[PDB]
Amino acid sequence: GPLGSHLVATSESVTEITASSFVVSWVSASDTVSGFRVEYELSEEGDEPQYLDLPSTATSVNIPDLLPGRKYIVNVYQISEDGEQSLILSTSQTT
């Protein structure tokens, strides 16, 4: 049954804890995507934003070098064959 969800997941859907890393996954809300671009910045300090580029076949990425005890804002954008970016997933986390 729906084990009520069973969070089934289990293992800290968040593994890459090292350096307070993050493991976020999304859906290629588009097959015309030529690649993906992930952006994460401190929701507090507002430091400078960082970008990570992944292939159109990528649907998940691990963000390392994160500052423990800090909140980061993550936004995944898919790049179309025209170079257009579209927000497919936006979420924040607290190392």
Tab-separated table of N, CA, C and O in Angstrom:
chain	number	residue	atom	x	y	z
A	1	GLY	N	0.871	-1.202	0.000
A	1	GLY	CA	0.000	0.000	0.000
A	1	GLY	C	0.888	1.226	0.000
A	1	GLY	O	2.095	1.121	-0.227
A	2	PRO	N	0.338	2.377	0.240
A	2	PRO	CA	1.131	3.632	0.248
A	2	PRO	C	1.975	3.761	1.508
A	2	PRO	O	2.376	4.863	1.869
A	3	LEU	N	2.230	2.652	2.198
A	3	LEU	CA	3.002	2.756	3.417
A	3	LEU	C	2.895	4.195	3.895
A	3	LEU	O	3.719	4.675	4.665
A	4	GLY	N	1.865	4.883	3.385
A	4	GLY	CA	1.641	6.284	3.721
A	4	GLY	C	2.788	7.117	3.169
A	4	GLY	O	3.029	8.244	3.600
A	5	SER	N	3.496	6.516	2.212
A	5	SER	CA	4.649	7.139	1.571
A	5	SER	C	5.903	6.330	1.877
A	5	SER	O	6.807	6.197	1.038
A	6	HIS	N	5.959	5.815	3.103
A	6	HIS	CA	7.110	5.051	3.552
A	6	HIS	C	8.339	5.911	3.402
A	6	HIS	O	9.457	5.394	3.390
A	7	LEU	N	8.164	7.225	3.227
A	7	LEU	CA	9.340	8.017	3.009
A	7	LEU	C	10.272	7.049	2.326
A	7	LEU	O	11.384	7.372	1.912
A	8	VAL	N	9.746	5.823	2.223
A	8	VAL	CA	10.447	4.726	1.598
A	8	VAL	C	11.894	5.112	1.392
A	8	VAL	O	12.809	4.388	1.782
A	9	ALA	N	12.101	6.282	0.822
A	9	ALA	CA	13.443	6.757	0.627
A	9	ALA	C	14.346	6.125	1.681
A	9	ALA	O	15.028	5.137	1.420
A	10	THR	N	14.320	6.690	2.884
A	10	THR	CA	15.125	6.158	3.978
A	10	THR	C	16.364	7.000	4.214
A	10	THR	O	16.304	8.116	4.727
A	11	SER	N	17.491	6.424	3.832
A	11	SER	CA	18.782	7.066	3.984
A	11	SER	C	18.708	8.563	3.713
A	11	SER	O	18.468	8.994	2.585
A	12	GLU	N	18.941	9.347	4.759
A	12	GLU	CA	18.928	10.796	4.639
A	12	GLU	C	18.851	11.217	3.176
A	12	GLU	O	19.838	11.701	2.622
A	13	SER	N	17.693	11.051	2.541
A	13	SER	CA	17.592	11.459	1.150
A	13	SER	C	18.736	12.424	0.875
A	13	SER	O	18.989	12.825	-0.261
A	14	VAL	N	19.420	12.774	1.961
A	14	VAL	CA	20.556	13.681	1.916
A	14	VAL	C	21.810	12.953	2.390
A	14	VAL	O	22.054	12.844	3.592
A	15	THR	N	22.599	12.449	1.450
A	15	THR	CA	23.815	11.728	1.809
A	15	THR	C	25.013	12.666	1.822
A	15	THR	O	25.485	13.071	2.883
A	16	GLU	N	25.500	13.004	0.635
A	16	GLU	CA	26.648	13.893	0.518
A	16	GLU	C	26.612	14.961	1.604
A	16	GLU	O	26.404	16.141	1.320
A	17	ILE	N	26.823	14.545	2.850
A	17	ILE	CA	26.814	15.490	3.960
A	17	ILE	C	28.195	16.110	4.123
A	17	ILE	O	28.335	17.202	4.670
A	18	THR	N	29.211	15.407	3.634
A	18	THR	CA	30.576	15.904	3.724
A	18	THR	C	30.614	17.370	3.314
A	18	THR	O	29.959	17.770	2.351
A	19	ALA	N	31.367	18.176	4.053
A	19	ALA	CA	31.448	19.596	3.743
A	19	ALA	C	30.043	20.185	3.689
A	19	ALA	O	29.829	21.267	3.146
A	20	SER	N	29.084	19.452	4.251
A	20	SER	CA	27.695	19.898	4.255
A	20	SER	C	27.140	19.889	2.837
A	20	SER	O	26.248	20.667	2.500
A	21	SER	N	27.684	19.005	2.010
A	21	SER	CA	27.254	18.897	0.622
A	21	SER	C	25.745	18.700	0.533
A	21	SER	O	25.082	18.419	1.532
A	22	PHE	N	25.214	18.846	-0.675
A	22	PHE	CA	23.784	18.688	-0.905
A	22	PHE	C	23.542	17.814	-2.129
A	22	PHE	O	24.279	17.888	-3.107
A	23	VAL	N	22.485	17.023	-2.093
A	23	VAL	CA	22.151	16.192	-3.238
A	23	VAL	C	20.725	16.493	-3.671
A	23	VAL	O	19.765	16.040	-3.046
A	24	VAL	N	20.592	17.278	-4.734
A	24	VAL	CA	19.275	17.655	-5.227
A	24	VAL	C	19.004	17.039	-6.594
A	24	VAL	O	19.884	16.991	-7.452
A	25	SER	N	17.774	16.578	-6.783
A	25	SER	CA	17.376	15.971	-8.044
A	25	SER	C	16.094	16.623	-8.548
A	25	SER	O	15.293	17.125	-7.758
A	26	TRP	N	15.902	16.620	-9.860
A	26	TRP	CA	14.708	17.223	-10.440
A	26	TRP	C	14.247	16.437	-11.661
A	26	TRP	O	14.674	15.303	-11.879
A	27	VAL	N	13.369	17.044	-12.454
A	27	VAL	CA	12.852	16.389	-13.650
A	27	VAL	C	13.106	17.243	-14.889
A	27	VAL	O	12.749	18.420	-14.927
A	28	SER	N	13.723	16.640	-15.901
A	28	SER	CA	14.013	17.358	-17.137
A	28	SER	C	12.726	17.903	-17.748
A	28	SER	O	12.380	17.582	-18.885
A	29	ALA	N	12.023	18.723	-16.981
A	29	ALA	CA	10.769	19.311	-17.438
A	29	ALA	C	10.834	19.684	-18.917
A	29	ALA	O	10.099	20.561	-19.373
A	30	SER	N	11.708	19.021	-19.665
A	30	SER	CA	11.837	19.309	-21.091
A	30	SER	C	12.914	18.437	-21.727
A	30	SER	O	14.043	18.370	-21.241
A	31	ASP	N	12.555	17.775	-22.822
A	31	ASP	CA	13.496	16.913	-23.525
A	31	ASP	C	14.312	17.725	-24.525
A	31	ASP	O	15.282	17.229	-25.099
A	32	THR	N	13.911	18.975	-24.728
A	32	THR	CA	14.609	19.848	-25.658
A	32	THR	C	15.759	20.557	-24.955
A	32	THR	O	16.484	21.345	-25.562
A	33	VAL	N	15.924	20.265	-23.669
A	33	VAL	CA	16.990	20.869	-22.888
A	33	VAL	C	18.348	20.414	-23.415
A	33	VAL	O	18.541	19.239	-23.729
A	34	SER	N	19.285	21.350	-23.516
A	34	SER	CA	20.619	21.028	-24.016
A	34	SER	C	21.565	20.778	-22.852
A	34	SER	O	22.648	20.219	-23.018
A	35	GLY	N	21.134	21.195	-21.672
A	35	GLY	CA	21.923	21.019	-20.465
A	35	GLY	C	21.192	21.625	-19.277
A	35	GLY	O	20.136	22.235	-19.435
A	36	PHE	N	21.753	21.458	-18.091
A	36	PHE	CA	21.133	22.004	-16.893
A	36	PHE	C	22.099	22.925	-16.166
A	36	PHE	O	23.312	22.755	-16.246
A	37	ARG	N	21.555	23.899	-15.456
A	37	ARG	CA	22.385	24.834	-14.716
A	37	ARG	C	21.856	24.989	-13.300
A	37	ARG	O	20.706	25.375	-13.091
A	38	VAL	N	22.704	24.678	-12.332
A	38	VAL	CA	22.314	24.779	-10.935
A	38	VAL	C	22.951	26.001	-10.287
A	38	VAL	O	24.130	26.282	-10.490
A	39	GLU	N	22.160	26.720	-9.504
A	39	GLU	CA	22.653	27.911	-8.829
A	39	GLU	C	22.315	27.852	-7.348
A	39	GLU	O	21.170	27.597	-6.970
A	40	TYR	N	23.318	28.082	-6.511
A	40	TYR	CA	23.117	28.047	-5.071
A	40	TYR	C	23.870	29.185	-4.396
A	40	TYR	O	25.031	29.451	-4.708
A	41	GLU	N	23.199	29.850	-3.465
A	41	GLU	CA	23.802	30.958	-2.739
A	41	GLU	C	23.288	30.973	-1.304
A	41	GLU	O	22.260	30.367	-1.001
A	42	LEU	N	24.005	31.659	-0.425
A	42	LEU	CA	23.600	31.727	0.974
A	42	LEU	C	22.354	32.589	1.134
A	42	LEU	O	22.324	33.746	0.713
A	43	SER	N	21.327	32.010	1.744
A	43	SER	CA	20.072	32.719	1.958
A	43	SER	C	20.230	33.792	3.031
A	43	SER	O	19.318	34.584	3.267
A	44	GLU	N	21.385	33.802	3.688
A	44	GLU	CA	21.637	34.775	4.745
A	44	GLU	C	22.677	35.805	4.317
A	44	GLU	O	22.361	36.979	4.123
A	45	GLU	N	23.922	35.361	4.191
A	45	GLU	CA	25.010	36.249	3.807
A	45	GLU	C	24.769	36.866	2.434
A	45	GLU	O	25.127	38.018	2.191
A	46	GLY	N	24.165	36.096	1.539
A	46	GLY	CA	23.889	36.586	0.194
A	46	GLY	C	25.143	36.525	-0.672
A	46	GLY	O	25.156	37.016	-1.801
A	47	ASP	N	26.196	35.919	-0.135
A	47	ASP	CA	27.451	35.797	-0.869
A	47	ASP	C	27.186	35.776	-2.369
A	47	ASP	O	26.060	36.002	-2.812
A	48	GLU	N	28.225	35.498	-3.149
A	48	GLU	CA	28.080	35.446	-4.595
A	48	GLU	C	27.532	34.091	-5.018
A	48	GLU	O	27.922	33.054	-4.482
A	49	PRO	N	26.635	34.090	-5.959
A	49	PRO	CA	26.003	32.841	-6.469
A	49	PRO	C	26.972	31.994	-7.287
A	49	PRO	O	27.827	32.520	-7.998
A	50	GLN	N	26.819	30.680	-7.189
A	50	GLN	CA	27.669	29.765	-7.933
A	50	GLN	C	26.820	28.987	-8.927
A	50	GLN	O	25.658	28.686	-8.655
A	51	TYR	N	27.388	28.676	-10.083
A	51	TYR	CA	26.640	27.950	-11.099
A	51	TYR	C	27.345	26.663	-11.497
A	51	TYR	O	28.567	26.618	-11.622
A	52	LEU	N	26.550	25.624	-11.714
A	52	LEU	CA	27.072	24.332	-12.123
A	52	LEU	C	26.327	23.868	-13.365
A	52	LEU	O	25.096	23.856	-13.392
A	53	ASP	N	27.072	23.511	-14.399
A	53	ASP	CA	26.455	23.078	-15.643
A	53	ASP	C	26.479	21.562	-15.787
A	53	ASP	O	27.514	20.920	-15.603
A	54	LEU	N	25.322	21.005	-16.123
A	54	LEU	CA	25.184	19.568	-16.306
A	54	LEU	C	24.543	19.284	-17.662
A	54	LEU	O	23.864	20.142	-18.226
A	55	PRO	N	24.741	18.108	-18.185
A	55	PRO	CA	24.167	17.714	-19.503
A	55	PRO	C	22.650	17.545	-19.445
A	55	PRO	O	22.077	17.331	-18.377
A	56	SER	N	22.014	17.646	-20.605
A	56	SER	CA	20.563	17.508	-20.689
A	56	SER	C	20.122	16.143	-20.171
A	56	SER	O	18.935	15.907	-19.951
A	57	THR	N	21.086	15.245	-19.984
A	57	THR	CA	20.781	13.906	-19.495
A	57	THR	C	20.899	13.848	-17.976
A	57	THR	O	20.524	12.852	-17.353
A	58	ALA	N	21.416	14.919	-17.383
A	58	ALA	CA	21.570	14.976	-15.934
A	58	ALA	C	20.261	15.404	-15.277
A	58	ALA	O	19.605	16.340	-15.733
A	59	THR	N	19.886	14.716	-14.204
A	59	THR	CA	18.652	15.042	-13.496
A	59	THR	C	18.897	15.105	-11.993
A	59	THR	O	17.958	15.064	-11.199
A	60	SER	N	20.165	15.209	-11.609
A	60	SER	CA	20.532	15.283	-10.200
A	60	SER	C	21.991	15.702	-10.072
A	60	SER	O	22.815	15.368	-10.923
A	61	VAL	N	22.309	16.439	-9.015
A	61	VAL	CA	23.680	16.893	-8.816
A	61	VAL	C	23.992	17.096	-7.339
A	61	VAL	O	23.113	17.424	-6.542
A	62	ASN	N	25.260	16.905	-6.989
A	62	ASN	CA	25.701	17.076	-5.612
A	62	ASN	C	26.504	18.371	-5.482
A	62	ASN	O	27.482	18.578	-6.201
A	63	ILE	N	26.085	19.236	-4.565
A	63	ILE	CA	26.772	20.504	-4.355
A	63	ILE	C	27.707	20.427	-3.155
A	63	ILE	O	27.263	20.452	-2.007
A	64	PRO	N	28.983	20.343	-3.403
A	64	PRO	CA	30.009	20.264	-2.341
A	64	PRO	C	30.524	21.643	-1.931
A	64	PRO	O	30.097	22.668	-2.463
A	65	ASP	N	31.456	21.645	-0.989
A	65	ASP	CA	32.057	22.883	-0.501
A	65	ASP	C	31.014	23.798	0.139
A	65	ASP	O	31.127	25.021	0.073
A	66	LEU	N	30.004	23.200	0.762
A	66	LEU	CA	28.958	23.980	1.415
A	66	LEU	C	29.368	24.335	2.841
A	66	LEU	O	30.088	23.580	3.495
A	67	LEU	N	28.910	25.490	3.318
A	67	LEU	CA	29.240	25.938	4.663
A	67	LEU	C	28.231	25.401	5.671
A	67	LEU	O	27.052	25.755	5.638
A	68	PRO	N	28.679	24.560	6.561
A	68	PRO	CA	27.810	23.955	7.611
A	68	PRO	C	27.160	25.017	8.498
A	68	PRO	O	27.790	26.014	8.851
A	69	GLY	N	25.898	24.796	8.852
A	69	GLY	CA	25.175	25.740	9.699
A	69	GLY	C	24.726	26.961	8.900
A	69	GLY	O	24.460	28.020	9.466
A	70	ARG	N	24.646	26.803	7.584
A	70	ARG	CA	24.228	27.901	6.719
A	70	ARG	C	23.077	27.469	5.824
A	70	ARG	O	22.969	26.301	5.454
A	71	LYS	N	22.225	28.424	5.467
A	71	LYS	CA	21.096	28.131	4.602
A	71	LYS	C	21.417	28.553	3.176
A	71	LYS	O	21.888	29.664	2.939
A	72	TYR	N	21.163	27.662	2.235
A	72	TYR	CA	21.432	27.954	0.835
A	72	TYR	C	20.161	27.861	0.002
A	72	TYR	O	19.282	27.043	0.277
A	73	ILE	N	20.092	28.674	-1.041
A	73	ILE	CA	18.952	28.650	-1.943
A	73	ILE	C	19.380	27.967	-3.231
A	73	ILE	O	20.374	28.352	-3.844
A	74	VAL	N	18.647	26.939	-3.623
A	74	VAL	CA	18.989	26.198	-4.826
A	74	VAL	C	17.917	26.356	-5.896
A	74	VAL	O	16.725	26.205	-5.628
A	75	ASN	N	18.360	26.649	-7.111
A	75	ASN	CA	17.448	26.814	-8.233
A	75	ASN	C	18.010	26.107	-9.458
A	75	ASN	O	19.125	26.394	-9.894
A	76	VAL	N	17.239	25.177	-10.004
A	76	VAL	CA	17.683	24.431	-11.173
A	76	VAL	C	17.041	24.981	-12.436
A	76	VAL	O	15.817	25.073	-12.535
A	77	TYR	N	17.875	25.336	-13.406
A	77	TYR	CA	17.383	25.866	-14.670
A	77	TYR	C	17.771	24.935	-15.809
A	77	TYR	O	18.899	24.448	-15.861
A	78	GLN	N	16.847	24.705	-16.732
A	78	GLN	CA	17.146	23.845	-17.867
A	78	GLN	C	17.451	24.718	-19.074
A	78	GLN	O	16.753	25.697	-19.335
A	79	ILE	N	18.506	24.375	-19.796
A	79	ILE	CA	18.902	25.154	-20.956
A	79	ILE	C	18.406	24.510	-22.240
A	79	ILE	O	18.705	23.352	-22.528
A	80	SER	N	17.638	25.276	-23.002
A	80	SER	CA	17.090	24.788	-24.253
A	80	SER	C	18.108	24.940	-25.378
A	80	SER	O	19.143	25.583	-25.209
A	81	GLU	N	17.807	24.338	-26.520
A	81	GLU	CA	18.704	24.403	-27.667
A	81	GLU	C	18.929	25.849	-28.104
A	81	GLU	O	19.845	26.135	-28.875
A	82	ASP	N	18.089	26.756	-27.613
A	82	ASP	CA	18.216	28.165	-27.972
A	82	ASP	C	19.009	28.924	-26.912
A	82	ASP	O	19.296	30.111	-27.072
A	83	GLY	N	19.365	28.235	-25.833
A	83	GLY	CA	20.129	28.860	-24.759
A	83	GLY	C	19.210	29.521	-23.738
A	83	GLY	O	19.659	30.305	-22.901
A	84	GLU	N	17.923	29.198	-23.806
A	84	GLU	CA	16.955	29.765	-22.875
A	84	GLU	C	16.922	28.957	-21.581
A	84	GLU	O	16.974	27.727	-21.608
A	85	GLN	N	16.834	29.650	-20.451
A	85	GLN	CA	16.793	28.976	-19.160
A	85	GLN	C	15.389	29.039	-18.569
A	85	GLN	O	14.704	30.057	-18.676
A	86	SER	N	14.968	27.947	-17.941
A	86	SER	CA	13.644	27.887	-17.333
A	86	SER	C	13.719	27.232	-15.960
A	86	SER	O	14.254	26.132	-15.816
A	87	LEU	N	13.185	27.912	-14.954
A	87	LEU	CA	13.207	27.378	-13.601
A	87	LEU	C	12.304	26.156	-13.495
A	87	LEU	O	11.092	26.246	-13.693
A	88	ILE	N	12.902	25.010	-13.185
A	88	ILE	CA	12.140	23.775	-13.063
A	88	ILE	C	12.051	23.338	-11.604
A	88	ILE	O	11.155	22.579	-11.231
A	89	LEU	N	12.981	23.814	-10.781
A	89	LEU	CA	12.978	23.447	-9.369
A	89	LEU	C	13.714	24.480	-8.521
A	89	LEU	O	14.875	24.799	-8.777
A	90	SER	N	13.027	24.984	-7.501
A	90	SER	CA	13.610	25.968	-6.596
A	90	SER	C	13.331	25.561	-5.152
A	90	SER	O	12.174	25.429	-4.752
A	91	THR	N	14.390	25.352	-4.375
A	91	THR	CA	14.224	24.944	-2.984
A	91	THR	C	15.430	25.356	-2.148
A	91	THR	O	16.545	25.457	-2.656
A	92	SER	N	15.197	25.586	-0.860
A	92	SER	CA	16.271	25.981	0.045
A	92	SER	C	16.577	24.857	1.026
A	92	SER	O	15.746	23.981	1.261
A	93	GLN	N	17.777	24.887	1.595
A	93	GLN	CA	18.183	23.864	2.551
A	93	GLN	C	19.086	24.456	3.620
A	93	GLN	O	19.716	25.495	3.415
A	94	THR	N	19.150	23.782	4.760
A	94	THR	CA	19.985	24.237	5.859
A	94	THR	C	20.988	23.153	6.237
A	94	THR	O	20.633	22.159	6.873
A	95	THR	N	22.240	23.347	5.837
A	95	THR	CA	23.284	22.374	6.135
A	95	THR	C	23.239	21.971	7.605
A	95	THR	O	23.008	22.841	8.429
